[PDB]
Ligand binder design. Sequence first.
Ligand SMILES: [Ca+2]
Length: 352
Amino acid sequence: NIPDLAKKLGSSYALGAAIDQTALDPKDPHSELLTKHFNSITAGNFMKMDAMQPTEGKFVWSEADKLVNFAAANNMQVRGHTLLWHSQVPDWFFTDPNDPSKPATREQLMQRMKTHIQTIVSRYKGKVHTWDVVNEVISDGGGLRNQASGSKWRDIIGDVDGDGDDSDYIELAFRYAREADPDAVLVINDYGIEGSVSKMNDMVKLVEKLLAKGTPIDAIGFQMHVSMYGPDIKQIREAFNRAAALGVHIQVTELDMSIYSGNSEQEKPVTDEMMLEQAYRYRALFDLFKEFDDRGVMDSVTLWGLADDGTWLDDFPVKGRKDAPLLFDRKLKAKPAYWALVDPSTLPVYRN
Ligand SMILES: [Ca+2]
């Protein structure tokens, strides 16, 4: 009987949550949490490349089919995460179909990319409105990812057109997607770009170059894996403005707020003081999101989980370290951060 979160924000942008299949089950209390508070859904893992095509030519439709049925039934949008990545992708993509000990060919990988993207996008035309077409293609160390930075796509496919630039595989992923669905919102998704000037420099250069080629990119997705320690609102606002200045929209795709700064701090108990501070920080973030929503350039904001009982941050970057990153706690109770969003007066903005 608490306020419905998405409704209270009164945003142009959709408010989403990442889920597993259990939130599609009516006998599960996570499902009613999703439909009460959110109007958009992303699959955390079940729409990744390895989940959708575990072996070549054998697509798995059951999970995404159930997702789209649930979403239509409950008047919710769906983001498709993700069509291309360098993690959670089957090994068969990058090896020669007849010699598993040798790499796939430019032509073979291009064709595989096209088949994966188009079979999936075509099936879900008009049911999945938005796709993370590529995920995390920029290295944290500078430039586009290659083998040294965990990805095999660019080394195999390379400079297809021979123009001296090798962003071809990314351009192709977008072109293939648009070809399969003229109406879908096509997103390049990444982490770290909200707080790293050097990484955002690369994102800006990449998107500028792709847009100049007529690449159908609609939005830059900011994962927004932040902590209670940073980055500051000013840094984020700056990165958001750089994205919006390119004429594309922004999406916040994987928002969570770790209680730890990195991997050195050992597990710690959650205190009401910590939760209050998290509430101030979430309030500030949602105030920032409103700035861009008022410009009509924020498409969606998605929390990376419904509640603290299902956060990937319990195992990243430290296996077995309990975090508290989301709007609802481990017993599905609304947290101070939730209360700051629906009733900003619950958050005291003065003392004495
Ligand atoms: Ca090229």
